[PDB]
Amino acid sequence: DDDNTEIIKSFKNFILEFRLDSQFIYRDQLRNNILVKNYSLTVNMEHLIGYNEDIYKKLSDEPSDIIPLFETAITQVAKRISILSLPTFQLILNSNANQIPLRDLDSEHVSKIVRLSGIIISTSVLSSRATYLSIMCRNCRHTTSITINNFNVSLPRSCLSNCGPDPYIIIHESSKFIDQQFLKLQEIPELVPVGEMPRNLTMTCDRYLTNKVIPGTRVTIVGIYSIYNSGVAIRTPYIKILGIQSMFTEEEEEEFLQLSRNPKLYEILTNSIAPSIFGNEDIKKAIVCLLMGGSKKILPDGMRLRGDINVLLLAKSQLLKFVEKVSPIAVYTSGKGSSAAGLTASVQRREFYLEGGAMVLADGGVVCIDEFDKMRDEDRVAIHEAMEQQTISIAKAGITTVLNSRTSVLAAANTTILSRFDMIFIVKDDHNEERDISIANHVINIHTEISIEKMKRYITYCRLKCAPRLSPQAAEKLSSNFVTIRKQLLINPITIRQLEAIIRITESLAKLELSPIAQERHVDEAIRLFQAS
Amino acid sequence: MGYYDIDDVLADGTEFPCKFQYDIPGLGYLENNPGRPITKNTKLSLPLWLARILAIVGPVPFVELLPPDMFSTKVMNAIKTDPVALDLHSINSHFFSLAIKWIMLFSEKELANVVSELLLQRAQELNHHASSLSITNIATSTFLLKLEEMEKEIYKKSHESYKDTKRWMFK
Amino acid sequence: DAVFGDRVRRFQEFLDTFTSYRDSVRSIQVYNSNNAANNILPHRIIISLDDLREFDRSFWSGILVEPAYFIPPAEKALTDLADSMDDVPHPNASAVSSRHPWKLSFKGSFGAH
Amino acid sequence: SLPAHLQQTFSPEEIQFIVENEPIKIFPRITTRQTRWQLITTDDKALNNMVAMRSTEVVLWIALLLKQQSKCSIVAPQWLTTKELDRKIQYEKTHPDRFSELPWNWLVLARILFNKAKDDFHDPIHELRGKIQDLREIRQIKVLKGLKYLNESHLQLDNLSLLEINELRPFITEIMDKLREIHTASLT
Amino acid sequence: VSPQQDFSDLMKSWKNERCSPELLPYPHQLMKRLLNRISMQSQLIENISMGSKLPLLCMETELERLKFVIRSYIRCRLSKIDKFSLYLRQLNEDENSLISLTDLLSKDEIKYHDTHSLIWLKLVNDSILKYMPEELQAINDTEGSVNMIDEPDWNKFVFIHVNGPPDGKWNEDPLLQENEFGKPCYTVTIPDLKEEVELTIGSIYVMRYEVIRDLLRDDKVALI
Amino acid sequence: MYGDLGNKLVLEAKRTKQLYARSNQDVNLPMYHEDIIRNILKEVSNLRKNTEYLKEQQQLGMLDDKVAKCQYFVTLLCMERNKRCLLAYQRLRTDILDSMAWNNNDTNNLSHQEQEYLKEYCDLITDLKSGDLVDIDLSGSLVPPSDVFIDVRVLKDAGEIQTEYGVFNLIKDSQFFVRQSDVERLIQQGYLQKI
Amino acid sequence: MFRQSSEEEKKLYARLYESKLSFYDLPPQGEITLEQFEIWAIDRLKILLEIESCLSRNKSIKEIETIIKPQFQKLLPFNTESLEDRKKDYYSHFILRLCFCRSKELREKFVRAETFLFKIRFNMLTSTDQTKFVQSLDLQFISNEEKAELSHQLYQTVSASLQFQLNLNEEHQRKQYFQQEKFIKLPFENVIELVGNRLVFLKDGYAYLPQFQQLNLLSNEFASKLNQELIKTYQYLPRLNEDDRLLPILNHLSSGYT
Ligand SMILES: [Zn+2]
């Protein structure tokens, strides 16, 4: 009976006295945690060992029994430093003991503190556990209460105030609860023996350790290794977790502004795109315009005006990979697609369902297609709606839904389908032996102007900050050029759907300078670059 | 409220709804048409540095001020139920400056009582997050995204003071 | 047990003070009584929580944090208000023991919840 | 001209500078009584007339200057002892609103003497270091209760130390000023 | 008068100047005497150096400690003169002013104020105001829709500590009444609220500046 | 409308204030917005032309009592708000330059009026620093003196240099034990560290 | 810790109705109209007439409360901050003093009706208001030792009353309430109506009364003081006779009871 008091006294004196140099680090941490309504304490094992090794020995022998005592000691200290009501505090641990590989845990480790690491592969939803709980006695209508703690309980049968064999029920109207969550840990990929599928474990956490990690992240874990009921005399193992380890600044935008006022920025950005590829100036310019894009607009009568850009390319393999790397968001695919959804979408079967291809998935970003001619039959017709409307709509087999397809498409191949694109060009080649020799020398080196990341961040900044408008002079220029070309064709087609593309190219060109208005300088370069032919 | 104060210069540019009481020639450029008159009972949104004068100068003054949305009844109820949870930054960036300007303009009594309680109640949690020094980021960061431009200066000048005292002491 | 009565009294004071809810009770009752002699509206009322805040803060927070102890007596007080108002005589067998009280609903300014 | 962080307040370095001008009692290990010091901001007779192991009073900065070398020893103030600090903690607990009547420079002087003069105390230093912490924590609780009475007119404080006031200054004054601005705007 | 007392007065002036919102008057006599003493002490240190090491160490570091305070004080005063330049000029131009500018400022401060005002006037006059119409070319305009002249906030809140009369003449001070069974006290009226408070000796307060300006001038209180 | 350009200009003042405040060591105030200021002054000239034309119509008698008064008054307010914006921006950059003048006593970002302004203020500072009150170094350190003697390590190879106290030879990664009052200037210049 | 720091008629009636009930203790001041005099007297007269009618019909307290409570909002409001309602109530009572002081039968009828109205309004109060109103009237509890010595007798006395009046059917609940209940000691002659029903414990000529009972003492003090004031009001009726414009109204008011 007295041992429960001495241990609590010992941990209470541990928190109140541990200085390293001049700061009571744990008194300060426990005060600073309460002010932000965080009821927990993060103790370090090495400091506990340094203070008194006997306390660590007791903790190491019987963790399941001794952890609650230290927690209630934390509560007793927490009340003194902040009151002249609080819940029970959560203890959290850090350690540097030798990691056990997940594959080696066995019957020798049951009810021991264990440190391991792996990859999280799944996460459950949150669930409720009880800590303080009230009880009603059915016969006499007497009432009492119980305090649960979550370490390895059932309702009692010692009736009070005969009173009967099993008279107790719960008043949920006057009880307290906490959160709980389940996780799955899979062993590290570079530790598995050859020819075997990786092994995994299941584990639990509660209160502040919940909702701290997501699937696919590599983590390190400290926790008690134990068993639970779910052959003969055989039980399942698991782990109780006690600890886990896993927009612009001003100085950034100053650099981007300095770039914006450079008189030769357009040349600089074109030169920075696929520098190994020789020639093909207008291709690089068109890719800059594709990356930057126009400006979206919405009108009083509800009509909606597109912002995206679309380009086709008729060597060519490299540029799509570069566009994938430089773009803020990017998807890469070949014409047949990743599944039966193809590029756009399809219905599959047993009840029917629907899944989207690599036009729905790239919504909000860029998508590049490696061979546009290998497009499937359904996608040939569906890309019309995917490009013009930026939507995909299906009414089949009782399904009736519409999907968003807001993206800019880059494509390459080697007909009427060319009408959907804003610009079309044909790739050109040159055959200097020095170029091939340089490439070969670089290949042997691995076998034996603006950088990508800076350019990507700059593109993000320009997309976020500016959305320019046409000046009146540009309007007069464009309308005169439009009627001029149509008259020239008449005496010898251009249509409104291409004028509205020239406008988007003009806005994208004005976007680089961060000029709020587009000007005749941009209109001239726009119509100059319009010569797809 | 100094002349050269940038925040006061910037706060005066916020627009308020207005209604006219005379037809006037040539001032259609306020309606973005320089070639036309303004007509009586037309409604426009004008910056405060202009509406503050056109509401006063005569008699009947030229313009009447309509009750703006940022002082609507819904905002007042939201303030009075739970001031600490409120996202004043989304409501208006310069709330406590425009509040004082409006109170001076119309000499409101009840609005002052509401605003004083709001400021006093939010200062408590502001001090709580100021005092909490590391020996955490998410718990502080969630609240500090709902501060006005007015409150951020007080938070910064409190945090630096506490930090300097701590640094000097434990040195 | 005694606290139940005082909360009923306090909500009766609230219902007497803000009179727009009496009109709702009476309008529903007279509408139902009219067409019965020849559709029927439910025995439900929606209260603004802001009125309850401005009337009594202690009752407002009691409703909003301890509903199990505050919602039932207020509903009982509403049933008493609707019952005291005049009603059609000679009810049938089913009407005499319906076990059908009035019920509440809320709108406005939940705040953190 | 002046730095931005010194427009309205004193930095802790200036607070240390202010505290250093106070007098303190010392035991010198050398006799100076029959060159001479010839100071211009203090008394000069005491340093010129020292006798070994005879108690005397000098400014704190000269005392720390001497204690840097063997030539001096510093007597602790009488309040800086275990019995007195126990009594002050009991006073703090007994009266849940009043501040105990500690001197205005207690934190600064304690954290100077523990560093420069750890060897001259009579009590064990590791207990004083705890009782100082207890006093500061209790006072911080009492401060946190007090910030709910910021108002348009004034406030009263008693026995609150210089460093504690300097810690809080920019918050109290700013919030009080804005409440003043909101109130007077309705009158005008 | 003694060298000991002048440094206490300097510390008093420095601390008061740091906190108060207005520009307080220059101590003309104290600064003359202090600067002369600094010069003499420097020459004495040089003579003794050319002639135990420890007294020289004390003298040198004492002179450093003395010079730092004056440096900070003068920098603060010049910073204040920057902010209230047009206000001080308008105060001087008012023939009916109860105090002259030369009473408030030292000669060096007068030079700084005048020439800095001319420099700043030349900068904006050529750049901006060269292009404005004649009605808006004034720089210190009071009549415009916004007042172009800044001035101190007389109602700023400040910490104070009540000293009482400096001589300990509690029986002689006419303002110093007494509370029941306790210390003497002063009384002040806060006029916006029509309310009174009792300022006991020794207790600390947060108080509006204008309400306690007269007692501060008479050294009955000291800013914390 | 006539206040849009000013509302855009003042945001640069707020931006440069925050950039300056974030890092006291990295003061390089950005490019003077010549173009926006020129556009604002052109707008003011347009308003002046409009007022002059309105005065001509007033002398012609075109309903001048009400019509000219109100239009003229509204134009006057539009001019005044622009004056406020320009003065605020220039005053902020003036304050930054005044802060830099005290420590120093490169030029491409400053406008030429500001370029001569800085020279004038440097002349003023050295005039105050000379003459009477010379005994206290008004541009010196503002941190109170803590210790007489310190240990300083040698960070940059400036070779042999002269100072009022004497001569030093700054051999890279050597260490001195010397009085702070001597080496305060060299620490500020950046040849030394306190360790 | 931190720390900061005719009109008289209106204040008089705010003081008088802070408790929400009054013994009608003090002389009114200022002026009202003669139309107000007549109408206010008639309103209180109507409520008291219905109270006496229901009592003659032998209806219970609950039935009378159901009958009379809707009439306050029309004739004589209660639990109200309005100065007009408070003055209406006070002045109407004082007028019916002058109407009903004239004879023993009128005095008895007025005392009965007004005391029953006092009981009704007291029942409408919250327990806090009842406590404050009783304390304001300057109205001996036994010691804990005396309660312990007499605990068996007091519990035997009140146990049935706790079950029937306070619905405490469970003996456990009755025991807990009795542990929390206070008792008052006074001479048995003061509570003789409870003595006749054997609702109080008697010892040595003193009656032991639980705190949850004893409202009859309050209403009896109200009735006795009202009777004494009416006897006083009768003695100086010759001063009322100086204004002839009031006598027809009082004759009209008294005619409904004769
Ligand atoms: Zn039982």
Residue numbers in the entry:
A (entry chain 5): 21 to 104, 131 to 198, 205 to 213, 235 to 303, 320 to 335, 348 to 415, 421 to 455, 460 to 524, ...
B (entry chain E): 1 to 58, 68 to 144, 158 to 193
C (entry chain 3): 18 to 55, 90 to 164
D (entry chain D): 2 to 35, 48 to 201
E (entry chain F): 54 to 104, 122 to 294
F (entry chain C): 1 to 105, 119 to 208
G (entry chain A): 1 to 5, 44 to 177, 181 to 299
Pull text from the paper.
Pol α-primase is a constitutive heterotetramer composed of a dimeric primase (PRIM1 and PRIM2 in H. sapiens [human], Pri1 and Pri2 in budding yeast) and a dimeric DNA polymerase (POLA1 and POLA2 in human, Pol1 and Pol12 in budding yeast). During eukaryotic DNA replication, Pol α-primase generates primers at replication origins to start leading-strand synthesis and every few hundred nucleotides during discontinuous lagging-strand replication. Pol α-primase binds directly to the leading edge of the CMG (CDC45-MCM-GINS) replicative helicase via a complex interaction network. The non-catalytic PRIM2/Pri2 subunit forms two interfaces with CMG that are critical for in vitro DNA replication and yeast cell growth. These interactions position the primase catalytic subunit PRIM1/Pri1 directly above the exit channel for lagging-strand template single-stranded DNA (ssDNA), revealing why priming occurs efficiently only on the lagging-strand template and elucidating a mechanism for Pol α-primase to overcome competition from RPA to initiate primer synthesis.
To assemble budding yeast replisomes associated with Pol α-primase for cryo-EM analysis, CMG was bound to a model replication fork containing a 39 nt 3′ flap, onto which CMG loads, and a 60 nt 5′ ssDNA flap to mimic the unwound lagging-strand template. Fork-bound CMG was incubated with Pol α-primase and the replisome accessory factors Mrc1 and Tof1-Csm3. Nonetheless, following extensive focused classification and refinement, these densities could be unambiguously attributed to Pol α-primase, enabling us to construct a model of a DNA engaged yeast replisome encompassing CMG, Tof1-Csm3, several small sections of Mrc1 and regions of all four Pol α-primase subunits. Pri1 is positioned close to the incoming parental double-stranded DNA (dsDNA) above a channel between the Mcm3 and Mcm5 zinc-finger (ZnF) domains, through which lagging-strand template ssDNA is extruded after strand separation. It is localized to the replisome through its interaction with the Pri2 NTD (Pri2NTD), which sits on the periphery of the MCM N-tier straddling Mcm3 and Mcm5. Pol α (Pol1CTD and Pol12) is situated between the CMG N- and C-tiers, close to Mcm3 and GINS and is coupled to primase via an interaction between Pol1CTD and Pri2NTD. Pri2NTD forms electrostatic interfaces with both the Mcm5 ZnF domain (site a) and the Mcm3 N-terminal helical domain (site b). Pol12NTD binds the Mcm3 AAA+ domain in the MCM C-tier (site c), where helices α8 and α18 of Mcm3 form an electrostatic cradle into which α4 of the Pol12NTD docks. Site d involves the N-terminal 5 amino acids of Pri2 (Pri2Nterm), where Pri2-F2—invariant in fungal species—docks into a surface-exposed hydrophobic pocket on the GINS subunit Psf2.
